[PDB]
Amino acid sequence: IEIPKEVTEEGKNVYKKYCAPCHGEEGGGDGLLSRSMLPKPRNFTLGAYKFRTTPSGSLPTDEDIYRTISYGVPNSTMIPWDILTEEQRASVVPVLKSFSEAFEYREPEPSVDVGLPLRPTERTILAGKKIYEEKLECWKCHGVEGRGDGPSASEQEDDFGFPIKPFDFTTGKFKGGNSPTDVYLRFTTGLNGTPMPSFAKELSDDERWYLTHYVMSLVQ
Amino acid sequence: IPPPDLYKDTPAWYQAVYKDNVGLSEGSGPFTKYFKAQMLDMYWQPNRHYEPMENLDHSIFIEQERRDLCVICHEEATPGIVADWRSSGHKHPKSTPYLSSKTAQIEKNVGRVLDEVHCFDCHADTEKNQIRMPTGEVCGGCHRQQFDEFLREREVGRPNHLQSWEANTIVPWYAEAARRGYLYGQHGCDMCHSGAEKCDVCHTRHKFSAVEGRQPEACMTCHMGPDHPDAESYGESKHGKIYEKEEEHYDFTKPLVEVRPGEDYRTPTCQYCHMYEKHGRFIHNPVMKGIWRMGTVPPSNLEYTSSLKDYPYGIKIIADKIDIYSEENVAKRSYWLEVCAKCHSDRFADTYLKSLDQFMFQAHTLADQAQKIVEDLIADGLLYPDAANRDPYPLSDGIVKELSADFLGEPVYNAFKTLQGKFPVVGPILGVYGMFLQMQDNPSDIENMYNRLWFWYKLQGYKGTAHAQQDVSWWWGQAPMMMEMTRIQAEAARLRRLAGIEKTIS
Amino acid sequence: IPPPDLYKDTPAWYQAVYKDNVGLSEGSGPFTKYFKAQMLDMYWQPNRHYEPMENLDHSIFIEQERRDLCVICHEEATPGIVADWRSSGHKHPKSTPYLSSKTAQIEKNVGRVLDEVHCFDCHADTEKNQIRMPTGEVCGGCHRQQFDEFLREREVGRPNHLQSWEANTIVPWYAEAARRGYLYGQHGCDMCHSGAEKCDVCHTRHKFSAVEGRQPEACMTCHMGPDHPDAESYGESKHGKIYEKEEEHYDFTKPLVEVRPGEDYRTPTCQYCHMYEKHGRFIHNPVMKGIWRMGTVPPSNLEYTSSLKDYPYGIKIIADKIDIYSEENVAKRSYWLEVCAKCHSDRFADTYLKSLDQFMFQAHTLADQAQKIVEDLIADGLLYPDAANRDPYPLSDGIVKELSADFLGEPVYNAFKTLQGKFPVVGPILGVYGMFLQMQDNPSDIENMYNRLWFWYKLQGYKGTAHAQQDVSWWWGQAPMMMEMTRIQAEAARLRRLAGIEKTIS
Numbered sequence A: 001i002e003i004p005k006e007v008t009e010e011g012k013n014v015y016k017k018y019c020a021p022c023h024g025e026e027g028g029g030d031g032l033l034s035r036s037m038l039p040k041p042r043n044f045t046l047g048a049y050k051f052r053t054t055p056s057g058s059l060p061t062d063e064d065i066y067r068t069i070s071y072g073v074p075n076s077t078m079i080p081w082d083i084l085t086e087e088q089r090a091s092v093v094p095v096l097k098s099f100s101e102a103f104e105y106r107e108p109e110p111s112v113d114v115g116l117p118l119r120p121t122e123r124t125i126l127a128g129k130k131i132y133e134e135k136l137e138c139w140k141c142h143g144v145e146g147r148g149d150g151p152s153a154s155e156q157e158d159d160f161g162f163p164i165k166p167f168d169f170t171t172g173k174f175k176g177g178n179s180p181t182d183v184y185l186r187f188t189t190g191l192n193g194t195p196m197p198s199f200a201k202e203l204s205d206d207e208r209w210y211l212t213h214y215v216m217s218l219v220q
Numbered sequence B, C: 001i002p003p004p005d006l007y008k009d010t011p012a013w014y015q016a017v018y019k020d021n022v023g024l025s026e027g028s029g030p031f032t033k034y035f036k037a038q039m040l041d042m043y044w045q046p047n048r049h050y051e052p053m054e055n056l057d058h059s060i061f062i063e064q065e066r067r068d069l070c071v072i073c074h075e076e077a078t079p080g081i082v083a084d085w086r087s088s089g090h091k092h093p094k095s096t097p098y099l100s101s102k103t104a105q106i107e108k109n110v111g112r113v114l115d116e117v118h119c120f121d122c123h124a125d126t127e128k129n130q131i132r133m134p135t136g137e138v139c140g141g142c143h144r145q146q147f148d149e150f151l152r153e154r155e156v157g158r159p160n161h162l163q164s165w166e167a168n169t170i171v172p173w174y175a176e177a178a179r180r181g182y183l184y185g186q187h188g189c190d191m192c193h194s195g196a197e198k199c200d201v202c203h204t205r206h207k208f209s210a211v212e213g214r215q216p217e218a219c220m221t222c223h224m225g226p227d228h229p230d231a232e233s234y235g236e237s238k239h240g241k242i243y244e245k246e247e248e249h250y251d252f253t254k255p256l257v258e259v260r261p262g263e264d265y266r267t268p269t270c271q272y273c274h275m276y277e278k279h280g281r282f283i284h285n286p287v288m289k290g291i292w293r294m295g296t297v298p299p300s301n302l303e304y305t306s307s308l309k310d311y312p313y314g315i316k317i318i319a320d321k322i323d324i325y326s327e328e329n330v331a332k333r334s335y336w337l338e339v340c341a342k343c344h345s346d347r348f349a350d351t352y353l354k355s356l357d358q359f360m361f362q363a364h365t366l367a368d369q370a371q372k373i374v375e376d377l378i379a380d381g382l383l384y385p386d387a388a389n390r391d392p393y394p395l396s397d398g399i400v401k402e403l404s405a406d407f408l409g410e411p412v413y414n415a416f417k418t419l420q421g422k423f424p425v426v427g428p429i430l431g432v433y434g435m436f437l438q439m440q441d442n443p444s445d446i447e448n449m450y451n452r453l454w455f456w457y458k459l460q461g462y463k464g465t466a467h468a469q470q471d472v473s474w475w476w477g478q479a480p481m482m483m484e485m486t487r488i489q490a491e492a493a494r495l496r497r498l499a500g501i502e503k504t505i506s
């Protein structure tokens, strides 16, 4: 439904009861249970969201945040919050936005246009294999099979100073969603706060569908 | 059918100090007001000491019966627990004919269908909408037969697992150590006596494997050390050496009553020897056939020279002298012989166990002779410092205030009320406090020498003899017992020599 | 890129006494001139003590680069070494995708092609045409990342493997024992502290198996016994019992960072717990997260009654009091909780490790109370014989001659120069000499009673509590600690009683 811009008392309470234990009382990702948690809960104060429909460096839209709250983040303790009502999940969006000054000064960039997903073929997969292994050498961080055991894997770090070793995605549980549109979105938007950049500039729309098709090919 | 109750047939005063939920704000037992529980008692003794979580509220996941969210979160928060649970028979209870069969009977008993046993089933309190540490009473809700056979340990008395937390905190030197700032020095005590409300103690947590519960290693984390070297004496025996080297061909998937002696086990396990009840019948507890129980209680078949001739001193609590040749213990010995006869001749087995009796008779005799030496020094007033110039018996003020002649008898309680515990207590059961805690010149050097004789070296030789380990029997047992007798005699002669000088200096 | 150097960031005086190659003609450390090295120090500490072979000249096989003749001869001279080497990843470095991958990066770093790693590569000195015992500096030539992560042990200080040979020979009672003819009585010392230049110490020789380096048994030859019962406390814990009985389903072929908690390991290993660095990052050394390090250094969070209130007495060398609740150690504790949270709740893990802290606080308190009793006897001049009529502190002449206030501070060095070591040294770190060597009436009986309290029984209960072994915690720990307190009080009362007679005889 409609996500408010205003902060409400209900929004404070929902965050307090269901989000503060991990993300912290002030959204610093420093709840008590964050000391022993891996991956670390998001520090909302930086305004850096991994999963957006906006280009690299931009803030998330209010709908981007509501989507992540509803769907959750696989390969982490970030469960789906479908257990909460539509309004409850929408009332905490401004609470998360109030943790970062960047939301008050800049406006989120326009959402990218997905377009029509290209038909996967033997041709598109091999064109993505070429990009993955030769043109951009994604096996550096992710490995030849995408297991997350490449040479540069163990040394990767957040912009928050935390180790972010790329998880094995051959299970098919992508953090932003396991849809072909979801994976294409990640390559078109980039993951803010992580060494995983946007390839909207290095590759065309068609080439990122080629790359998406090969990435899905690595799933079991 | 009454819901499972671990504290069945216990008086209200006993349940008020052992079952009623205090927080960490109090202790347990008759001296619950004299100390506070250690932090981990939330987990070791949940009924008495568990407190709810304080960081992440779990109520909403219980209130809307979201069993799925328990797994989705803990799959990533605590992957080890989920990996165990996904691999256990609780996740796949109808995956084998054996599992399907036992599950069907449980479904009839609980009136429910059990396609899986979930974290919700063991942890989610529905009435209060809070997370719970499942005691044996929750487990007994489904496994009623195992709960009752475990409850049958009460029939033989202490020591046993059912009354394990009782023995931990009922002794007065537990609270006294906490009074003096050594509460957490007893960390291993609460951890080892936690098998009273935790059923994950042999078959461990979240795998709950009957295969794991039946192998000897499941008992060895607790049953080891100087006062009960059970793991060492068995493991290093021919029974244990053959098991360790032939374990691949042991079939631990078969329940004990289905185990063919010789073909499935070549040598017996702790569970096979001890969980045998009688006449080919097994039971889900290992204590039913004990005779020499711990090796500490003196047998009634001996004539003692120390005050052991008057044990147990009219004390209602502690056990009286064991009659080795009573009708009850001769029958118990015959049940043991039924186990040994499956791989030995009756003669060889009876000859060996009769040698165990002979070792214990001479070992208790050796301990009595050492206690006579210590008590003669006391009677001759040669103990230095004397009972007047040293700390009293541990928690003597709490003993007088909390106990009575109903517990200790008139002569023992009268002495505590009159003398306020300013007297020595030497020998089996209640004289062992010096093994655990050192107060102001109490005990003395020679009292703990004797304590190590009857509570360490007699017990190690006992377990070595009973478990067929010759090195533990002699070199951990008899020979150190003789060595403490050497130290006790030299100290007795030293105290008489010093006194013989303090007199010719007047 | 600078060649690998184990002695990086060490002063020239330190390398002159620890790295510069003397033969067996001299010792090592500041007291290198006071003793001679044991024979096996050629192999335990090659840089300092190795000498060339003397029977069969190997130069011609090196001079003509006859790698083939090394195998042809040793295939029959020492078949075991060849059998290990033929089965190792050094013989078949491109036999698996994992091995082929790591080999490719090494080929780039060394500018060479490595179809096999030969005896020539590890043993043949090319410049001098002699056989060499490969130290970690040779291994670091190819395994530069592992060498540097091993070198990072210097960041936390002693104890660690990098500075292991330092700790062995730097203490003054090593050379003193050699002065008196007991040099080879320290045979196990040089053998156990040899993990400073030998990389074959966890993953053993000529098989160099990462699978073997990752299983707990690789550490148990060294980490056992009365001052560090690490093998016993882990092995007999539920973590170790489950590993020993489920080891067939542990995947030790996976590096630690790829190990899935719960599915690959059900319970952790020494390597999994200790080689974890922080935040999901592992490191090739086990010492980075130590807090209570050995259990000997007193924590600063306690108020002591003995001279521990003034520890470390202005001594620059030994470590100062550990602040358990410093920002650095709270972060270290959080790194531990990241390990435990993979199979436990944060609450259960934090509650347990907080109990480890409480056990150590009360154990250090118990040791301080015992040290007060011993020091009061010294202050009252009741130590018999006194410091005047007994041997001085071990190697007091060498301490004055070789050390200064730069090492020990002005007050400690001034006392050694003035009194020539004719004074007692009691308690943590430098008072432990009596544990190792007995000189002429030095130490006394009661000093070694206390030594066993804080260096044996406090440490065993410490390791038992930290490794979740309840029997080691109490019966190897607290209870023996209380028993030494019994002996210390009786001896203190005995020495005061004797003196009270020697006065009324004047």
Ligand code: HEC
Residues within 6 Å of the ligand: A039, A131, A132, A136, A137, A138, A139, A140, A141, A142, A152, A156, A164, A165, A166, A167, A169, A173, A174, A175, A176, A177, A183, A186, A191, A194, A195, A196, A199, A211, A215
């Ligand atoms: C190191 C700088 C990397 C390079 C080069 C590539 N990737 Fe990456 N990737 C990296 C990190 C640190 C992360 C985040 C991991 C986390 O735990 O958050 C990622 C993420 C991905 C994903 C997952 C997307 C999702 O929704 O979960 C994918 C599918 C992915 N990366 C693909 C990918 C491709 C195609 C690359 C070459 C163009 C590539 N990665 C390079 C680190 C790095």
Ligand code: HEC
Residues within 6 Å of the ligand: A033, A077, A079, B052, B053, B054, B055, B056, B058, B061, B062, B066, B067, B069, B070, B071, B073, B074, B077, B119, B120, B123, B124, B131, B132, C345, C346, C347, C348
């Ligand atoms: C993510 C939001 C979780 C959900 C959904 C569930 N659990 Fe949980 N649990 C989670 C964390 C981060 C913790 C640690 C809390 C702490 O204080 O350290 C826990 C804790 C537990 C425990 C342990 C209780 C104790 O005293 O140690 C249990 C037994 C438990 N959780 C069970 C449980 C159940 C039954 C759930 C479904 C109703 C459930 N959890 C959901 C994370 C999350």
Ligand code: HEC
Residues within 6 Å of the ligand: B088, B089, B090, B093, B099, B100, B102, B103, B106, B114, B117, B118, B121, B122, B134, B135, B136, B138, B139, B140, B141, B142, B143, B199, B200, B203, B208, B209, B210, B211
């Ligand atoms: C009802 C939901 C139950 C609860 C409460 C407990 N258990 Fe259970 N358990 C249940 C079933 C239907 C089964 C499968 C059939 C069978 O009885 O074997 C089990 C299984 C076990 C096992 C054996 C599993 C195996 O060997 O693979 C054990 C050892 C066991 N259960 C123990 C146990 C404990 C310790 C409990 C309290 C924490 C407990 N059960 C509760 C049903 C139910």
Ligand code: HEC
Residues within 6 Å of the ligand: B158, B159, B160, B167, B168, B171, B174, B186, B188, B189, B190, B192, B193, B221, B222, B223, B224, B225, B227, B228, B293, B294, B436, C470, C471, C474, C475
């Ligand atoms: C595991 C190594 C244990 C530790 C630590 C503690 N106890 Fe225990 N205790 C344990 C066993 C296996 C037994 C019986 C052994 C046998 O063969 O019978 C006992 C026995 C006792 C007893 C006497 C028996 C009784 O009256 O019930 C007492 C009084 C007792 N234990 C108390 C006790 C205390 C005070 C402890 C530390 C402060 C302690 N135990 C630690 C197992 C273990």
Ligand code: HEC
Residues within 6 Å of the ligand: B216, B219, B220, B223, B228, B230, B231, B234, B235, B239, B268, B269, B270, B271, B273, B274, B289, B290, B291, B292, B293, B294, B336, B466, B467
């Ligand atoms: C058959 C060879 C056995 C094996 C295997 C195990 N135990 Fe045993 N135990 C056995 C006998 C014949 C006795 C003496 C019984 C008597 O009182 O006459 C014991 C004794 C004990 C006890 C004391 C209780 C008692 O029965 O008196 C304990 C606590 C004990 N044993 C423990 C134990 C453990 C831990 C074992 C596995 C390592 C184990 N036993 C194996 C016979 C046999």
Ligand code: HEC
Residues within 6 Å of the ligand: B343, B344, B345, B348
């Ligand atoms: C030679 C290879 C033997 C064969 C064939 C059988 N037995 Fe045996 N037995 C043998 C030895 C060396 C011993 C021990 C001798 C000693 O003094 O210790 C035994 C002992 C027995 C016993 C004694 C009690 C016991 O140990 O259980 C019995 C009851 C026994 N043997 C039975 C037995 C049976 C039934 C045999 C045929 C299947 C048999 N033995 C063959 C050596 C040999």
Ligand code: HEC
Residues within 6 Å of the ligand: B345, B346, B347, B348
């Ligand atoms: C059933 C009638 C049996 C026949 C036929 C054989 N054996 Fe036996 N044996 C049997 C029993 C019930 C016992 C126990 C006797 C006791 O006093 O407890 C035995 C004993 C033995 C022994 C052990 C001797 C010892 O000192 O322990 C041996 C070595 C033995 N039996 C061997 C043996 C042989 C060689 C037989 C064929 C001639 C034979 N047995 C037959 C039961 C029966």
Ligand code: HEC
Residues within 6 Å of the ligand: C088, C089, C090, C093, C099, C100, C102, C103, C106, C114, C117, C118, C121, C122, C134, C135, C136, C138, C139, C140, C141, C142, C143, C199, C200, C203, C208, C209, C210, C211
């Ligand atoms: C260059 C010739 C090297 C020397 C000098 C050392 N090592 Fe080596 N090692 C080398 C390669 C190319 C490989 C295979 C790829 C890989 O790194 O795994 C190895 C292998 C090992 C291993 C693992 C082998 C296995 O697990 O099967 C270990 C544990 C190892 N090497 C240790 C080691 C030690 C102790 C060295 C000094 C004696 C040493 N290496 C020197 C290359 C070279």
Ligand code: HEC
Residues within 6 Å of the ligand: C158, C159, C160, C167, C168, C171, C174, C186, C188, C189, C190, C192, C193, C221, C222, C223, C224, C225, C227, C228, C293, C294, C436
């Ligand atoms: C293996 C059983 C060893 C023997 C034999 C010796 N040492 Fe050792 N030592 C060993 C370990 C594993 C540790 C640390 C344990 C821990 O948990 O921290 C130590 C510690 C020391 C220390 C103090 C630590 C330091 O300052 O570095 C010293 C001074 C020391 N060791 C010296 C020493 C001497 C003098 C020995 C015999 C003559 C000796 N060690 C033997 C391992 C082992």
Ligand code: HEC
Residues within 6 Å of the ligand: C216, C219, C220, C223, C228, C230, C231, C234, C235, C239, C268, C269, C270, C271, C273, C274, C289, C290, C291, C292, C293, C294, C336, C466, C467
């Ligand atoms: C997880 C259950 C662990 C296992 C498996 C092993 N160790 Fe451990 N160790 C662990 C903790 C939490 C601690 C205390 C840390 C603190 O200081 O608070 C220890 C302690 C040690 C030490 C002392 C160094 C230190 O960290 O203080 C040593 C030398 C040690 N442990 C050795 C050791 C060995 C040899 C192991 C395999 C048998 C082993 N550890 C396993 C946690 C865990």
Ligand code: HEC
Residues within 6 Å of the ligand: B080, B084, B200, B201, B203, B204, B205, C238, C239, C242, C261, C262, C265, C266, C267, C268, C273, C336, C339, C340, C341, C342, C343, C344, C349, C352, C353, C468
């Ligand atoms: C997965 C590899 C684990 C890690 C990481 C840690 N622990 Fe563990 N532990 C694990 C299992 C499967 C078990 C058996 C559960 C049982 O019923 O005993 C344990 C056991 C313990 C215990 C004893 C539990 C009991 O009921 O007595 C303790 C006290 C314990 N573990 C502590 C602990 C600590 C401090 C850890 C971090 C250093 C830790 N565990 C990690 C599995 C795993």
Ligand code: HEC
Residues within 6 Å of the ligand: B042, B043, B044, B045, B046, B070, B071, B074, B078, B081, B082, B085, B090, B117, B118, B119, B120, B121, B122, B123, B133, B134, B198, B199, B200, B205, B206, B208, C343, C344, C345, C348
């Ligand atoms: C009955 C068969 C259970 C099932 C189903 C689950 N758990 Fe469990 N849990 C059970 C017991 C007997 C205990 C120990 C109780 C005690 O007082 O010691 C536990 C404990 C836990 C804990 C506590 C902390 C720890 O030991 O790590 C946690 C966090 C926990 N259990 C989690 C958990 C999860 C996530 C489950 C679903 C996969 C689950 N438990 C199921 C018994 C049973």
Ligand code: HEC
Residues within 6 Å of the ligand: B158, B159, B160, B161, B163, B164, B167, B191, B192, B193, B194, B195, B201, B202, B213, B218, B219, B220, B221, B222, B223, B270, B271, B274, B286, B287, B290, B292, B293, B294
């Ligand atoms: C820790 C919990 C364990 C586990 C893993 C095992 N035992 Fe048991 N046991 C434990 C305690 C603390 C006590 C005594 C409690 C008290 O003092 O009241 C016992 C007792 C026994 C006994 C009785 C001994 C006697 O009668 O004198 C037996 C026979 C026994 N334990 C056997 C046993 C077996 C076979 C085990 C593996 C299946 C086992 N124990 C494990 C503590 C613990």
Ligand code: HEC
Residues within 6 Å of the ligand: C158, C159, C160, C161, C163, C164, C167, C191, C192, C193, C194, C195, C201, C202, C213, C218, C219, C220, C221, C222, C223, C270, C271, C274, C286, C287, C290, C292, C293, C294
């Ligand atoms: C003999 C060589 C071994 C081997 C096989 C292992 N360890 Fe280590 N270790 C050894 C010594 C002699 C010392 C102390 C040296 C000194 O006094 O300076 C250590 C030290 C450690 C420590 C540090 C302890 C502390 O901080 O107080 C740790 C954590 C440790 N050792 C762990 C460890 C592990 C995990 C091992 C198996 C991979 C292992 N050791 C093997 C000697 C030896």
